[PDB]
Amino acid sequence: RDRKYLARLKLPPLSKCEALRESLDLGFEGMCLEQPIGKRLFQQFLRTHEQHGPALQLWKDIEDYDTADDALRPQKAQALRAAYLEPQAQLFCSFLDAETVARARAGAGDGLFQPLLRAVLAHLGQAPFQEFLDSLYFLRFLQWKWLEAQPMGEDWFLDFRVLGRGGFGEVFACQMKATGKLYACKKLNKKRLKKRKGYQGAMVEKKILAKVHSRFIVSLAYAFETKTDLCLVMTIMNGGDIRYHIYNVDEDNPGFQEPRAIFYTAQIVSGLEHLHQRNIIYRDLKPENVLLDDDGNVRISDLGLAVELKAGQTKTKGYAGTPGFMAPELLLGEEYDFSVDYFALGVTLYEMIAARGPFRARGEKVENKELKQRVLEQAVTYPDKFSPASKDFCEALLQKDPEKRLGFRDGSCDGLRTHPLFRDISWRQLEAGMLTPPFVPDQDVGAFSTVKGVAFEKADTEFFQEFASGTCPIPWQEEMIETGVFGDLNVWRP
Amino acid sequence: SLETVVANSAFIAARGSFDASSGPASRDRKYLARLKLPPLSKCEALRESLDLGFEGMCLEQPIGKRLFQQFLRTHEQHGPALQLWKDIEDYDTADDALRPQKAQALRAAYLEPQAQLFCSFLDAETVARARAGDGLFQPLLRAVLAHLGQAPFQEFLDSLYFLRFLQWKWLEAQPMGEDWFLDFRVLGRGGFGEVFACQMKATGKLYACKKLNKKRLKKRKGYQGAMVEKKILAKVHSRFIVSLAYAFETKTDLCLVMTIMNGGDIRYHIYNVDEDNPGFQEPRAIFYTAQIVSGLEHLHQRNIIYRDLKPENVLLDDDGNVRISDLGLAVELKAGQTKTKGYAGTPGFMAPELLLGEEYDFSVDYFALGVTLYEMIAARGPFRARGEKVENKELKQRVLEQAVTYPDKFSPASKDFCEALLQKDPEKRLGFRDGSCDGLRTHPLFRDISWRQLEAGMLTPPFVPDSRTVYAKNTVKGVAFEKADTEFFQEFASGTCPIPWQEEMIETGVFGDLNVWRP
Ligand SMILES: Nc1ncnc2c1ncn2[C@@H]1O[C@H](COP(=O)(O)OP(=O)(O)OP(=O)(O)O)[C@@H](O)[C@H]1O
Ligand SMILES: Nc1ncnc2c1ncn2[C@@H]1O[C@H](COP(=O)(O)OP(=O)(O)OP(=O)(O)O)[C@@H](O)[C@H]1O
Ligand SMILES: [Cl-]
Ligand SMILES: [Cl-]
Ligand SMILES: [Cl-]
Ligand SMILES: [Mg+2]
Numbered sequence A: 001r002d003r004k005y006l007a008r009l010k011l012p013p014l015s016k017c018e019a020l021r022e023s024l025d026l027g028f029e030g031m032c033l034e035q036p037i038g039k040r041l042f043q044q045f046l047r048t049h050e051q052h053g054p055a056l057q058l059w060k061d062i063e064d065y066d067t068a069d070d071a072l073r074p075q076k077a078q079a080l081r082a083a084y085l086e087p088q089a090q091l092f093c094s095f096l097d098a099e100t101v102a103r104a105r106a107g108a109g110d111g112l113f114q115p116l117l118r119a120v121l122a123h124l125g126q127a128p129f130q131e132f133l134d135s136l137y138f139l140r141f142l143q144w145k146w147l148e149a150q151p152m153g154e155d156w157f158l159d160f161r162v163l164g165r166g167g168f169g170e171v172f173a174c175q176m177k178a179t180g181k182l183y184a185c186k187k188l189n190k191k192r193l194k195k196r197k198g199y200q201g202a203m204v205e206k207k208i209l210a211k212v213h214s215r216f217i218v219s220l221a222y223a224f225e226t227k228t229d230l231c232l233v234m235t236i237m238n239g240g241d242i243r244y245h246i247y248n249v250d251e252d253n254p255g256f257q258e259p260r261a262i263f264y265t266a267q268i269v270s271g272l273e274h275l276h277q278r279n280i281i282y283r284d285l286k287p288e289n290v291l292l293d294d295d296g297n298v299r300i301s302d303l304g305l306a307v308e309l310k311a312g313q314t315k316t317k318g319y320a321g322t323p324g325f326m327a328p329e330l331l332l333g334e335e336y337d338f339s340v341d342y343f344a345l346g347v348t349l350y351e352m353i354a355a356r357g358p359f360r361a362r363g364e365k366v367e368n369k370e371l372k373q374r375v376l377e378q379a380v381t382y383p384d385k386f387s388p389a390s391k392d393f394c395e396a397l398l399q400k401d402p403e404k405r406l407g408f409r410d411g412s413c414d415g416l417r418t419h420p421l422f423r424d425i426s427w428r429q430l431e432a433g434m435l436t437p438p439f440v441p442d443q444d445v446g447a448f449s450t451v452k453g454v455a456f457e458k459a460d461t462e463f464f465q466e467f468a469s470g471t472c473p474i475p476w477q478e479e480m481i482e483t484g485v486f487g488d489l490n491v492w493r494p
Numbered sequence B: 001s002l003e004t005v006v007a008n009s010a011f012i013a014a015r016g017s018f019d020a021s022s023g024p025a026s027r028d029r030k031y032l033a034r035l036k037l038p039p040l041s042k043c044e045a046l047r048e049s050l051d052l053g054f055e056g057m058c059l060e061q062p063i064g065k066r067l068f069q070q071f072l073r074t075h076e077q078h079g080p081a082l083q084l085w086k087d088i089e090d091y092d093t094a095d096d097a098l099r100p101q102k103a104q105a106l107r108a109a110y111l112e113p114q115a116q117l118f119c120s121f122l123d124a125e126t127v128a129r130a131r132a133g134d135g136l137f138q139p140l141l142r143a144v145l146a147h148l149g150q151a152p153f154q155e156f157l158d159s160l161y162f163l164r165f166l167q168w169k170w171l172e173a174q175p176m177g178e179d180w181f182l183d184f185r186v187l188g189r190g191g192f193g194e195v196f197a198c199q200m201k202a203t204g205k206l207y208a209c210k211k212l213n214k215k216r217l218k219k220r221k222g223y224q225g226a227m228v229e230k231k232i233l234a235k236v237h238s239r240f241i242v243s244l245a246y247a248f249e250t251k252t253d254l255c256l257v258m259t260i261m262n263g264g265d266i267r268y269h270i271y272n273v274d275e276d277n278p279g280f281q282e283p284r285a286i287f288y289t290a291q292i293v294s295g296l297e298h299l300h301q302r303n304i305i306y307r308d309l310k311p312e313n314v315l316l317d318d319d320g321n322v323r324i325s326d327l328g329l330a331v332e333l334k335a336g337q338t339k340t341k342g343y344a345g346t347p348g349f350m351a352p353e354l355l356l357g358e359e360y361d362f363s364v365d366y367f368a369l370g371v372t373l374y375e376m377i378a379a380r381g382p383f384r385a386r387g388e389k390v391e392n393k394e395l396k397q398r399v400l401e402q403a404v405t406y407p408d409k410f411s412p413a414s415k416d417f418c419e420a421l422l423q424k425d426p427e428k429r430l431g432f433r434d435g436s437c438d439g440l441r442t443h444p445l446f447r448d449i450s451w452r453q454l455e456a457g458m459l460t461p462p463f464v465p466d467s468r469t470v471y472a473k474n475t476v477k478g479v480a481f482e483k484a485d486t487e488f489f490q491e492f493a494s495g496t497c498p499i500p501w502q503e504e505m506i507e508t509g510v511f512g513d514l515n516v517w518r519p
């Protein structure tokens, strides 16, 4: 780590945090549940106030139960109720309803304590939260927010190796100089962006990666600009892409074993769900856009073709996506919704298992017009390599009529998650990142030809300024904690 | 040079299993539960009303010092200043054997451009001066503290540590009266009511509570003495004078809560040390003399005349260190007043100036010291034989006219010192000069005493009282109160003394418990 940059991570005097008091969202769920540093500080406040001890420990124990192994749950349920739900107990939680205590004692299930969690957090949002606002712990939060809003641009990042190559520039592995955390930095050449009219795609990707927070979608930590580039610093994925691994796993016998395909399918679906729950259509799901990290967990990426539906918009028009992955509705010029992403999922799963597209044989020469005809007309056949479950699931996704296609219903994919293909998958543990991935992994092309005849107007500069919106709060807080900097700077008496 | 008040290891570990019982031992959970830091909103009125001077807040108030030093410790750039400050204090209170090497360590740590804790902010001249040279580093300390009072203090004012101080001050101002104290046994008896050993119910800290019956006070017109004792004990902070922690009132009594002294008083020890051969050995007498003098000196530096030094008013604590007490006859001289009139004191301890009706200063206390040292050594008054029947009028004549004789039990040093103090003419008498007793401390009686360690409470007393033993021998008619009384009682009962209160919170563990950020 560069000492120069670490020396700029210092908490400021309280006087410089005044303007922040007024300007910030001081809502409970925003500050104390969703912001990692806000959660840590709130919990500390609770830990130093004996009267709020029971609330805090039930909160942590419900979280510990939610993410525990199947084997250990029965016992943790029993310990919880003995600890918090009994009049006699030392950590008894008076503040709870008679009605809530009853239910929490009743039964055994995946979301056994979610009703309990809701009550605990509702209570925490009242008196305790107000006491928090009147404590040093909140002033310390303000100090952290101030630091969070300080300029952290180009100079803070050291590119040290090329991870990949895109249409507008390279993607680099880089180090955040101050903390040492590693990231991918996607560079987009400004002149090439302008000349090829890529502004909209650039911006939509950035907006989407900034507002969405899912362990199945690459996260944007920082957006900045340099003299020649726009830059997105995001989750580093060193594992390579699914497409590579389909054919590299075994050159002679390509394709994944069924369990491995199911696992990635489960992670991709969850990623799709997170987008669809936010009224976003991906429109570019395909194996080369699903990246593996160091542990072998996957995330979707490449959000430049996505679209965000407006408040109370249910469908959209737009010819976009990759030939072979675009659904009939889309190809036919019709209005479509999330349905197109589930079609893409089907093509994707199909290739994961068969090592070839549903509509063309492996390494076959097919121009776009014929591929469009195949997708609209050709029935997909399934080799012996498919199980009945995998066959049926793909069929359900590759249904040409969207109305008959399996997908996002009633605000979730919970129906889709019911398909026997996923019989062995634990969804609660998958969603929490607790499962063991099925496989764990272990060139100097040069520079692009500086494009000609590109001068910038104020409008271009303004777009660049708007793009380079700086630091994303949540990932920044996650970095501070992961990296040790929160620990070091938050000490009261070492 | 001041000490940093730290949690009392032993006391706090004896506290856990006193609490496990439901007996009087246990600190009362009700009162402990009222020791809680308030929300910041309640500290606003305090920001304006308080003295936020550097020396007052960060040097003299133990919790202020403690929080300022934490601020310095968590700010890397003020690291050198802090450690140099702590090391100068360590040097000042270290054994004579260890000093040479602590001096060298200090100069290598802080006074070298090369060193990692080098102190840039210092002068070339203070650096230079500090590399030469008691008092070796006083100039240096004054420069370190002068520096600390500027930028770093201003950064502290703009930090959470200052807000935390305000919180503690709020708690310091909250009502802590009669109901907070458990009287559990009787320590002694005075002119207006008993002195009790008492426990502060919230912290468990032990104290002496001196009770003065209101009616008996009025009837015997003892208000002035009550108030003078309380104001003096409140404003002075010496390890050689009993300290006032709280002043409150009850329906029947006025109450001073103060340093508990369980060792008994010097008079008792003169005669009970060996009933057949009474008196102290010379070294022991010198030791107490040096502690008494230091207490006199603190009073005299504040323009206070004690007027009641005598063996029965010098109390021992559990370690065997003594403090002066009983300040009801003292007088505080007004700004620019140099002397006073007034016939007060104990027959046989009052100096001729006083007895003759003349103006007098601190000189009378030194006469009293001489009488006291004489008795410590000889086991009898200079003016009367042991257990002799002498009425006041003749005692006054002896004190004015009789030359004191000295038996073989005195050394030449002891004899000379007492003669210096028992000079009948104040102008010829050894005592307070030029704002100190430094001149007096020069007498060879004190050859063996290390003054800086005495003054810092580091020396080992020559006699340690046994915690088993007690060193002391086994309505008022028709009085009503107008309002001059109610208002006097209200004014007397001025509540909590900040510094002893903060000392109590730190020693007793409560500062540590309530000051944690993340446990
Ligand atoms: N987070 C990441 N970590 C590591 N490599 C990445 C990451 N994101 C993208 N890449 C790699 O960087 C390159 C660019 O991928 P990306 O899909 O962002 O490019 P693009 O220019 O948007 O491509 P397209 O023209 O398909 O939209 C590829 O080599 C890709 O595998
Ligand atoms: N801090 C203390 N710790 C223990 N005992 C004390 C303390 N202060 C006073 N006493 C005991 O109580 C006795 C009476 O106290 P003190 O002499 O101060 O009261 P007083 O009424 O002023 O007496 P007088 O009127 O004779 O001066 C003392 O002789 C002593 O034994
Ligand atoms: Cl607080
Ligand atoms: Cl495989
Ligand atoms: Cl701070
Ligand atoms: Mg793209």
Ligand SMILES: [Mg+2]
Pocket: B312, B313, B326
């Ligand atoms: Mg007395």
Ligand SMILES: [Mg+2]
Pocket: B225, B326, B327, B328, B329
């Ligand atoms: Mg008295």
